């Protein structure tokens, strides 16, 4: 199981609108993170035999977190965090280290066209699996238990990869975000969980 | 104490509006996006109140006892219930504005509510 870390510098922020008034999300879903990675190999093509040129990277695990302060504003929901930093962790085993590292440098935007994001540095390595009590900052699933004080937790709804095809709605999956609503920031939460990969001290929780 | 300061600033804006018969200073205060706009209104409203004081058309009083300000815009007699801000309230309010211009919008909304209630009763 290989892991990779990437540091992104945002220009003005990201904007993803909720499916089904056009409110937006607080943090990008894993689908956008996988699509950004897939952009490095499928550049120039928009329809493959027809739902998306991204129904092939569906089994790559990804998480992301903030490192600065921002504000969520509806004026079409947007998340303004200019000059901020984003840390993205990719965990997978489908491809070797070289291919993941090459695709990691080829990220251009997160969400829509205006949400450009440069790349500052990357790291590649081998991860280890643990199950003891850990502290994490990345968001995880709803079914994961919590031992600490419930004070900085929010509930969101994301979709599986089934939504990659047009004319079809993805399955609804609940997610828990360790985020402060105003101002926008990230906080640490202690979880027990069953599977956690150590990617450099900042344990990533998946189930 | 922040709410008391905002309330005293709202009383000053309401007295200035009732005396001048103009909403323009309250509109400028409620739409302020900088400390410059807020501070300019705080001067201009106090300058209007100073003229009313010199003419004896604005005076402090008590009413059943609560502190109040009587305003004569001619026969149109108005009474605003509460205190006017102190120099320390203006200084502490300007410090609140340097942190968050929202407090100018809050004071403007309160001032317009005071003035509207008094104009309706009159």
């Amino acid at each position: 199981m290989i892991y990779s870390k990437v540091f992104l510098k945002l220009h003005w922020g990201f904007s993803v609108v909720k499916p089904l008034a056009k409110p937006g999300f607080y943090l990008p879903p894993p689908t956008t993170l996988i699509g950004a990675l897939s952009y490095g190999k499928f550049r120039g093509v928009d329809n493959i035999n027809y739902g998306s040129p991204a129904y092939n990277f569906r089994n790559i695990m990804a998480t992301a977190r903030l490192e600065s302060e921002g504000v969520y504003t509806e004026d079409t929901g947007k998340v303004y965090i200019p000059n901020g930093r984003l840390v993205v962790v990719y965990v997978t085993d489908s491809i070797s280290k070289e291919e993941l590292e090459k695709l990691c440098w080829s990220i251009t935007r997160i969400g829509c066209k205006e949400c450009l994001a440069s790349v500052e540095n990357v790291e590649v390595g081998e991860a280890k699996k643990v199950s003891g009590r850990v502290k994490t900052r990345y968001y995880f699933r709803d079914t994961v238990k919590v031992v600490g004080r419930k004070e900085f937790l929010e509930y969101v709804t994301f979709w599986e990869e089934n939504g990659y095809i047009w004319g079809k709605e993805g399955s609804p999956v609940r997610y828990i975000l360790p985020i402060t609503t105003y101002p926008l920031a990230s906080k640490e939460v202690e979880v027990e969980a069953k599977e956690a990969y150590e990617v450099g001290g900042e344990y990533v929780v998946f189930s | 104490e922040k709410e008391n300061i905002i309330g005293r600033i709202a009383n000053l804006l309401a007295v200035g509006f009732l005396y001048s018969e103009s909403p323009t200073l309250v509109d400028r205060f409620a739409n302020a996006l900088s400390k410059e706009a807020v501070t300019k209104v705080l001067y201009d409203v106090q300058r209007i109140v100073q003229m009313g004081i010199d003419r004896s058309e604005i005076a402090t009083t008590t009413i059943t006892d609560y502190p109040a300000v009587n305003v004569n815009s001619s026969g149109a007699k108005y009474t605003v219930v509460g205190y006017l801000p102190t120099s320390q309230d203006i200084e502490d309010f300007l410090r609140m504005i340097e942190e968050d211009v929202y407090y100018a919008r809050k004071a403007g909304a309160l001032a317009m509510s005071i003035a509207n209630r008094i104009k309706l009763g009159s």
């Binding site: 490095g40 329809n47 303004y80 200019p82 000059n83 090459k102 080829s106 205006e114 | 340097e98 942190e99």
Partner: protein, 316 residues
């Protein structure tokens, strides 16, 4: 590809308005958080959206293309960029709708030959068999630099009156003066190339012949954006723009420069260009820099003086 980061200085400007309240026209602002020793401060700062820039770029491209004889759509000759979206739009131009998925590519090519703007700008057709085309030019929001501990931007309201001899006449306009920075991307390599898999359809030879002219026109259209011909309210509120810093990179692989929010953003992007060429096995990597505020540049860069030389070098 071509990537660019540009720094601007604008005074007494009102280009992008927002919803009017009462008798007031308001400017577009966004919230930012600034770090202080005491703590954090939330401030509202004027911005300019990325749609007006796209509209100006498309209008300039139309004007340049109609001079060289390149095909232009009927509804795009008029400055109404609805594009081939619904059946009513296709009825005026005279294009039959796609039959099924397998024929989709053909439809695209036909559209791609009847309107240049639908090619470079991109189009979307809603219906039973949708067709897509991503824009070849990518633009971002114009936000003033958050540098140091001070935001160099303001916003005031101005009072205006109309004179009449029989009073029975008052309005307000918001004006601003900031120090803007914006970045953009363009891919001249993908111009005149279809974006749908399948078998080649008759008519691609015309696109191959017109590729060079379309690329030249697309590159030329950047001059209007880099010269300051965007936005509105220019009849009575004409702004006063000026160029301070500019970095343009031409490569053969994906790359973007650093945002122009710091005082030293050219050295970083040059070093990152070198590092990225080292890993992505690139061959071509060139950087052109225009400097007017006297910030540090580095070594290994050709220094220009105006924007016209930049366009000439990009075309060459």
């Amino acid at each position: 590809m071509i990537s660019g980061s540009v720094r601007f200085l604008v005074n007494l400007e009102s280009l992008n308005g927002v919803e009017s309240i009462g008798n007031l026209t308001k400017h577009r602002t966004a919230p930012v958080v600034l770090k202080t020793s005491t703590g954090y401060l939330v401030r509202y700062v004027p911005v300019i959206s990325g749609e007006a820039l796209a509209h100006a770029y498309q209008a300039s491209l139309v004007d340049i293309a109609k001079k060289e004889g390149l095909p232009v759509g009927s509804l795009s000759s008029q400055y109404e960029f609805i594009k081939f979206s619904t059946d009513e739009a296709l009825k005026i131009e005279g294009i039959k709708e796609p039959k099924d998925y397998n024929d989709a590519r053909r439809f695209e090519v036909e559209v791609m030959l009847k309107d240049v703007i639908a090619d470079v700008g991109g189009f979307m057709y809603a219906g039973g068999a949708p067709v897509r085309r991503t824009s070849r030019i990518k633009l971002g929001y114009m936000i003033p630099a958050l540098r140091g501990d001070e935001i160099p931007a303001q916003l005031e309201a101005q009072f205006h009156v109309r004179f009449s001899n029989k009073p029975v006449a008052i309005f307000n306009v918001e004006v601003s003066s900031a120090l803007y920075t914006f970045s953009f991307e363009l891919d001249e390599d993908l111009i005149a190339v279809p974006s749908t898999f399948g078998e080649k359809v008759k008519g691609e030879e015309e696109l191959e012949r017109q590729k060079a002219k379309r690329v030249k026109s697309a590159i030329k259209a950047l001059y209007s954006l880099l010269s300051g011909n965007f936005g509105g309210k220019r009849s009575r509120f004409l702004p006063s723009m000026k160029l301070m810093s500019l970095v343009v990179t031409k490569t053969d692989f994906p790359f973007m420069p650093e945002p122009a929010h710091d005082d030293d953003y050219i050295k970083t992007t040059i070093m990152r260009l070198g590092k990225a060429k080292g890993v992505l096995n690139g061959n071509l990597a060139k950087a052109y820099v225009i400097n007017n505020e006297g910030i540090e540049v580095g070594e290994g860069v050709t220094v220009l003086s105006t924007v016209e030389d930049l366009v000439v070098k990009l075309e060459e």
